[PDB]
Amino acid sequence: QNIQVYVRVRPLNSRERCIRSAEVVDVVGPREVVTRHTLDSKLTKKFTFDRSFGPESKQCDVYSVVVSPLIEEVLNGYNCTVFAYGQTGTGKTHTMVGNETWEDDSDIGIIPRALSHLFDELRMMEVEYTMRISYLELYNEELCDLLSTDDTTKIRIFDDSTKKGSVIIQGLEEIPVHSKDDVYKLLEKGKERRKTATTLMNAQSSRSHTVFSIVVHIREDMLKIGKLNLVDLAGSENVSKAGNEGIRVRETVNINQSLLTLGRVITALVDRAPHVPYRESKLTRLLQESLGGRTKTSIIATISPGHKDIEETLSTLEYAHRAKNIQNKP
Amino acid sequence: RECISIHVGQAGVQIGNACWELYCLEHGIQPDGQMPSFNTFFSETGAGKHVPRAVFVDLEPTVIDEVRTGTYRQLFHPEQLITGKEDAANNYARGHYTIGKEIIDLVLDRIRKLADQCTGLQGFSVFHSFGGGTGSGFTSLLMERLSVDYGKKSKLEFSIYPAPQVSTAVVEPYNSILTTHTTLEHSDCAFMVDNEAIYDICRRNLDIERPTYTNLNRLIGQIVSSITASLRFDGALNVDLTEFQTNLVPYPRAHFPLATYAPVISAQLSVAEITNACFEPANQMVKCDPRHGKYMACCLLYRGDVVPKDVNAAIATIKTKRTIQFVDWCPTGFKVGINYEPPTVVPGGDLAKVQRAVCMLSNTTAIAEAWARLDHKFDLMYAKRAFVHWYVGEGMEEGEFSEAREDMAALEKDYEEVGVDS
Amino acid sequence: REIVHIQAGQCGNQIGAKFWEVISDEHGIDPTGSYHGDSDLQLERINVYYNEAAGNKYVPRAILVDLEPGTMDSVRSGPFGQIFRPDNFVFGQSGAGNNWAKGHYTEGAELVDSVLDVVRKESESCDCLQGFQLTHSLGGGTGSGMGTLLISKIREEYPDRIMNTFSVVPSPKVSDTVVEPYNATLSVHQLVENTDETYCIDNEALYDICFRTLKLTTPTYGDLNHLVSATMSGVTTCLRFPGQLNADLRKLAVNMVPFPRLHFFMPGFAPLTSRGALTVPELTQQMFDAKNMMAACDPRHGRYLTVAAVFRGRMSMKEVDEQMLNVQNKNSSYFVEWIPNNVKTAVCDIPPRGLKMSATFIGNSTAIQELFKRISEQFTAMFRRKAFLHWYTGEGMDEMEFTEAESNMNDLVSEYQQYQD
Ligand SMILES: Nc1nc2c(ncn2[C@@H]2O[C@H](COP(=O)(O)OP(=O)(O)OP(=O)(O)O)[C@@H](O)[C@H]2O)c(=O)[nH]1
Ligand SMILES: Nc1ncnc2c1ncn2[C@@H]1O[C@H](COP(=O)(O)OP(=O)(O)NP(=O)(O)O)[C@@H](O)[C@H]1O
Ligand SMILES: Nc1nc2c(ncn2[C@@H]2O[C@H](COP(=O)(O)OP(=O)(O)O)[C@@H](O)[C@H]2O)c(=O)[nH]1
Ligand SMILES: [Mg+2]
């Protein structure tokens, strides 16, 4: 019932070596106790999580540890969701999606590995299935369907009478998939349709919340609908650090104002407020059922080990640790 | 032997109004610039005109008009007058990143024109508000550019700090946390005064139930006048600005002096009886208690007709009345400022024509108590995470707050640490 | 700094008529556009609400929009009838008639784009936009219909600008038709997510103030506008004249809003009395008193989040803050705990003409949760029978559009429950 919360540490990037930033954060894999501190190793804080991940770990390894055990539980008729969030350039987009695209061995991301891995899972049961996908990005409080051909229709988000936590979306073209080749041709267009710009922090820095959900029906009779939300959020952007002068600065407002709403959702749920303000962000309503409902959710945090970006590193770890107190309704 | 002026934000403009008015009247300058019938804060062109070495920059064009469209518009050259086009909305975030980055470059250009016009720059005085946004964001970025170009220069700050109880804006406690990292690391000397205790004097010594900003500002102006303008005239012992960083700041991160100045009588004042009031807690201009803390360093500056020889007895009476718990690190830390020139009353002011005046500067552990007043105010609003979206909107992340909050704790301990040593 | 103000709907167009009449009498500008005042400070910030014209004339930077010509023609007929330039009139025939679906979605939508052109043309000739004011109804189909869509397109074009709304809340006391509450659920459904700040006014309070303090026997409908008229001027007062703490519009928004959703406030004008004592503390007592709240709720039922005070006249904040500090202590239960200073002071130097002192109240308290509970109950009760839906169903509005209007409404109401106590 408790939400699994893991954390990954990225290696030092070029600028981290160009500014000559030393490693202040270290990990212990099996013990899952990430040790972080300031420059002078005098006082250090202790963070306990379900798992830890060093910089040399692979993409399929993190997929094997946390994501893989949740693949098999989808068929029972339960929802799952996992997303990375944190400072810009921590490596969230590469962790969830992967930079360049069969087996669960190479540096391929989580999403195309999930399609390859789950496809055999359904074929092993020999069940009747109708699997579809969904690619959308939240850019400046607007909904744009990547998978859809036209997407000119004004996409709104409505509530539902039966499903209390869920929300109804109009205009989501649920294309059926029976072969992995068909999924890869559209998904690569999705990341081709993914709005991205070049920043000094990251030349391939995400510029929108890409909530990539997966839904499949099961019929063999007790009908079941499998639901999995492979969410890829935008990172927190220190507007001075990234560097922009403009149209990009309008993007920073909506992205940064959105993450701030996310944290309060955890703040209210941990302290058990009578109600939680999901209504202030479209993003919050997308994960409203995911956060404090009938869903086994997980979170994969990424943090830079740079001594300079210690503040965003330490502050981001707060919501990660507090999330273990949040409960669900299995 | 010359220094320039910086007045940022509405606080800086209206305060300087009396400051330069004093400066203009202290030396017999007319409101036009034509001295009828020394040059430290003014340059003189051949036309018989003086110009103030000032920098008045505001992000809102509202307040500047009062000076350049009313009186004193002849004394200023619009060359110095820089003006923005939209207020920072009391947001350090918008003041620092959004708007200030687009104006700051214009300001720096006017500075190098003045610094070259002067010879042997002594430094400059900073005027802004810690509570207000304009005085928080635009100031902070401005200060950082100064230390980059002018490393070996004095940086005085007069930041009016809000009251523990009385307040004007709601987000005042948020700006103070952001400015702490800015002033402490960059600025060498900063002065914090609060209008609350300033009200206390105006309704006790002046017996005035209608004190406005103008009345409080004329008081602050007299403090700055004796600190610099008097030190441009020779006496028994003249003082400079630079020794304060060594005579008043005995360690790098120990610089937030307390200022007192209370020769305030409505229209008999002996010498020593006046000096006693400088240590009376009831007119310290900041809501704190000297008995709660201790006294680290303290230097005086005497104005007008003062004779040092019989003065030494009065200084001894401070030691003879030893109930203030003077610290052990500095036994003989008393630099005496002796200026022969007396202060002057502005016509229509609320101060009486005195023949002698004394203004005290002193660092102490009592200023650490004022931080205890603030710290709780900041933490409560941060717990519910309210009003935080505005600062995130301009792009300053919340991580700045967590980082800056520790600097408040670390600084407040450093003052507490000194008392322990014996 | 420039600000554009919009009028929409049968009621909204009437309210502004007195508004500009006050602002014109403020600076002393004759209706025709010639300036004949005596104060030079009046021309110091004329740019805020006017554009310079040929022959030294002035044009109210206004946009007059409606679905019915008769109401607007009366404005151009009476006094200040030539003050607008007729090109700003944008209207059509076949008024909606309390039909929000027709005003917002189907009919006004054809006229919407024509207004945006006049809105877009106005902004570019202006130096730099500051805020956007829209006076309209919440229960009236037309103003709420077009106005909500008007705000959606405008804010989409101008994310950096201020969306201030002076709107009239459907009063549970007096109305002509019992179908009025339906519009409110449909009105705010678009407002909160697309508005920066909102002002709430009730007719019951309107007649309440004119009856109690003014002691008038026949409260005319125009005289009620005379009350709301100056209240908007209080918000703008920091922009026109030089003051001690000139709190700009966006500055005021940041001081009140504790969270990007809860931005509904209750204005009120204190210094109004019968012919019969005029001190500065005299204003402070009337400020906190419930008899000046323009909402149909007791502010003491809930608790305050933030309170802005804008004073008009030669005043010392010492006389203010000491008087102000008592309110923090006198009613300690009335303010929340995590905000130490609930007050926001703003001292504009110049008061209005005639009076020597004045006070402008701006407060966001939890009391508004009650005002919306009035609408929600009637909305849900009439929704169960599905009565008079075919009046709206045929226009092309799905049922689920109403469904979210229910939950999203009460969520705003439930927010203040926690923040109160
Ligand atoms: N004692 C005193 N305080 C002043 C005076 N003028 C301004 N202040 C303080 O300055 C604070 C606001 O500072 P500013 O940043 O300069 O205000 P601003 O220039 O309009 O810029 P914003 O704060 O962003 O609106 C107020 O809360 C006052 O307490 C003054 O004349 N006397
Ligand atoms: N574990 C890792 N080892 C090496 N390089 C990595 C690792 N994780 C991420 N990177 C690289 O770091 C850069 C940042 O990629 P990205 O995933 O976009 O960062 P981010 O934190 O997601 N910021 P954003 O793009 O806005 O989501 C890319 O060039 C990745 O290839
Ligand atoms: N203050 C004020 N309110 C008015 C006036 N005229 C109408 N109203 C209010 O406006 C509300 C309905 O507005 P409405 O006439 O339907 O606007 P419409 O949408 O254009 O039709 C009513 O409940 C009235 O209380 C007026 O002159 N002054
Ligand atoms: Mg200000």
Which has the closest alpha carbon to B324: B381, B272, B357, B364? B364
Please tell me whether residues C360 and C390 are part of one structural domain.
Answer: no
- The pair of three-digit structure tokens given for residue B49, joined into one six-digit string: 């005109």
Which has the closest alpha carbon to B254: B113, B108, B411? B411
Residue B78 backbone phi and psi in degrees, to 5: -55, -20
- The pair of three-digit structure tokens given for residue A283, joined into one six-digit string: 């993003």
Q: Could you tell me if C349 and C315 are in contact, meaning their C-beta atoms sit under 8 angstroms apart?
A: no
Q: Please name the amino acid found at residue B47.
A: A
> Angle B301-B302-B306 (CA atoms, 0-180°, nearest 5)?
155
Which has the closest alpha carbon to B86: B78, B94, B97? B94
Please check if C225 is assigned to a binding site.
yes
**Helices within B35-76 (DSSP H only):** 65-68
What is the SS3 assignment for B224?
Answer: helix
**CA separation, residue A250 to residues B246, B303, C124 (Å):** 47, 56, 20
Which has the closest alpha carbon to B126: B153, B97, B100, B166? B153
Residues of A in contact with B385 (CB under 8 A): 260, 263-264, 267
Interatomic CA distance for residues B124 and C110, integer angstroms: 62
Interatomic CA distance for residues C226 and C208, integer angstroms: 14
What is the SS3 assignment for C273?
Answer: coil
Q: Could you tell me if A292 and A326 are in contact, meaning their C-beta atoms sit under 8 angstroms apart?
A: yes
- Please list, in sequence order, all residues whose beta carbon lies within 8 angstroms of the beta carbon of residue B90, skipping any fewer than 6 positions away: B132, B133, B134, B169, B171, B172, B175, C251, C254, C255
Q: Please name the amino acid found at residue C105.
A: Y
Q: DSSP letters along B182-209, please? A: HHHHH-SEEEEE-HHHHHHHHTTTS--S
What is the SS3 assignment for C403?
Answer: helix
Q: Nearest-CA distance from C268 to chain B in Å?
A: 20
- The CATH fold of domain B1-257: Rossmann fold (3.40.50)
For residue B83, the cross-strand partners are B58
Indicate the angle between helix axes B399-420 and B366-384, nearest 10 degrees. Answer: 150
Nearest CA in chain C to A257: C260
Residue A328: exposure state from Cβ atoms within 10 A (0-12, 13-18, ≥19): middle
Neighbours of A124 (CB within 10 A): 8
Q: List all residues whose CB is within 6 A of at least one atom of ligand 3.
A: C 9-11, 14-15, 98, 137, 139-143, 168, 175, 203, 206, 221, 224-225
- The pair of three-digit structure tokens given for residue B265, joined into one six-digit string: 């009588």
Q: Could you tell me if A42 and A60 are in contact, meaning their C-beta atoms sit under 8 angstroms apart?
A: no
Stretch (H or E) spanning B6: strand B2-8
Please check if B135 is assigned to a binding site.
yes
Q: Which atom of ligand 2 is nearest to the CA of A196?
A: 25
Rounded-to-5 percentages of helix, strand, coil across chain C = 50, 20, 35
> Angle A299-A305-A310 (CA atoms, 0-180°, nearest 5)?
90
- Please list, in sequence order, all residues whose beta carbon lies within 8 angstroms of the beta carbon of residue B191, skipping any fewer than 6 positions away: B156, B157, B158, B159, B223, B256, B257, B259
Q: Please name the amino acid found at residue B61.
A: P
- The pair of three-digit structure tokens given for residue B195, joined into one six-digit string: 């209008």
CB of B11 closer than 6 angstroms to any ligand 1 atom: yes
Look up the domain containing C391 and give its range. Answer: 368-421
CB-based contact B400 A311, cutoff 8 Å: yes
The total of structural domains in chain C comes to 3
Say whether residue C250 is in contact with chain B using an 8 A CB cutoff. Answer: yes
- Please list, in sequence order, all residues whose beta carbon lies within 8 angstroms of the beta carbon of residue A47, skipping any fewer than 6 positions away: A7, A33, A34, A35, A36, A317, A320, A321
- The pair of three-digit structure tokens given for residue B197, joined into one six-digit string: 């205790």
Q: Please name the amino acid found at residue C383.
A: F
Which of the other chains make 3 or more beta carbon contacts under 8 angstroms with chain C? A, B
Q: Could you tell me if A239 and A248 are in contact, meaning their C-beta atoms sit under 8 angstroms apart?
A: no
Please check if B222 is assigned to a binding site.
no
Question: If phi over 0 gives left and psi between -120 and 50 gives alpha, with beta otherwise, what is residue C354?
Answer: left
Interatomic CA distance for residues A222 and A219, integer angstroms: 7
Experimental approach was cryo-EM
Report resolution (Å) to 1 decimal.
Answer: 4.4
- What's the gap in Å between B366 CA and the centre of ligand 4? 28
Nearest CA in chain C to A268: C418
CA torsion through residues C242, C248, C249, C254, sign: negative
Please tell me whether residues C327 and C380 are part of one structural domain.
Answer: no
| Positions of B marked active-site | 243
Residues of B in contact with A314 (CB under 8 A): 399, 402
HSE toward the beta carbon, residue B342, CA cutoff 13 A: 11
CATH class of this structure's domain B367-422: mainly alpha
- The pair of three-digit structure tokens given for residue C308, joined into one six-digit string: 């802005």
HSE toward the beta carbon, residue A234, CA cutoff 13 A: 30
Q: Nearest-CA distance from A289 to chain C in Å?
A: 15
Instruction: Write the DSSP symbol of residue B378.
Output: H
- Please list, in sequence order, all residues whose beta carbon lies within 8 angstroms of the beta carbon of residue A161, skipping any fewer than 6 positions away: C403
Q: Ligand nearest C344 Cα, by number?
A: 1
- What's the gap in Å between C15 CA and the centre of ligand 3? 9
Q: Ligand nearest C170 Cα, by number?
A: 3
- The CATH fold of domain A4-325: Kinesin (3.40.850)
HSE toward the beta carbon, residue C228, CA cutoff 13 A: 30
Interatomic CA distance for residues C88 and B74, integer angstroms: 43
Please tell me whether residues C180 and C64 are part of one structural domain.
Answer: yes
Interatomic CA distance for residues C151 and C119, integer angstroms: 11
Q: List all residues whose CB is within 6 A of at least one atom of ligand 2.
A: A 10-11, 55, 88-95, 99, 202, 204-206, 234-235
Which has the closest alpha carbon to B155: B129, B181, B113, B184? B184
Q: DSSP letters along C8-22, please? A: ESHHHHHHHHHHHHH
For residue B125, the cross-strand partners are B5, B156
Please tell me whether residues C24 and C68 are part of one structural domain.
Answer: yes
Residue B7: exposure state from Cβ atoms within 10 A (0-12, 13-18, ≥19): buried
Which has the closest alpha carbon to B300: B332, B348, B338, B344? B338
Nearest CA in chain B to A317: B399
Neighbours of B148 (CB within 10 A): 10
The CATH number given to whatever domain includes residue C147 is 3.40.50.1440
Rounded-to-5 percentages of helix, strand, coil across chain B = 45, 15, 40
Q: Could you tell me if B133 and B88 are in contact, meaning their C-beta atoms sit under 8 angstroms apart?
A: yes
Nearest CA in chain C to A157: C404
Largest CA distance in chain B: 66
CB-based contact B392 A260, cutoff 8 Å: yes
Domain residue ranges of chain B, discontinuous segments joined by +: 1-257, 258-366, 367-422
- The pair of three-digit structure tokens given for residue B139, joined into one six-digit string: 């100031």
Q: Could you tell me if C103 and C139 are in contact, meaning their C-beta atoms sit under 8 angstroms apart?
A: no
- The pair of three-digit structure tokens given for residue B13, joined into one six-digit string: 């403009």
Q: DSSP letters along C234-251, please? A: HHHHHHHS-BSS---HHH
Residues 333-352, chain C: which have Cβ within 8 Å of B? 337-345
Q: Which atom of ligand 3 is nearest to the CA of C224?
A: 1
CA torsion through residues C316, C317, C320, C322, sign: negative
- Please list, in sequence order, all residues whose beta carbon lies within 8 angstroms of the beta carbon of residue B202, skipping any fewer than 6 positions away: B208, B211, B215, B216, B350, C318
Residues of A in contact with C157 (CB under 8 A): none
Residues of A in contact with C260 (CB under 8 A): 257, 280
Residues B258-366: name the CATH superfamily. Answer: Tubulin/FtsZ, C-terminal domain (3.30.1330.20)
Interatomic CA distance for residues C295 and C272, integer angstroms: 17
Q: DSSP letters along A211-263, please? A: EEEEEEEEE----EEEEEEEEEPPPB--HHHH----HHHHHHHHHHHHHHHHH
What is the SS3 assignment for A131?
Answer: strand
Site to substitute for ligand 2 among A202, A212, A316, most atoms within 8 A of C-beta: A202
- Please list, in sequence order, all residues whose beta carbon lies within 8 angstroms of the beta carbon of residue C278, skipping any fewer than 6 positions away: C271, C356, C357
Residue nearest to atom 5 of ligand 3 (CA): C11
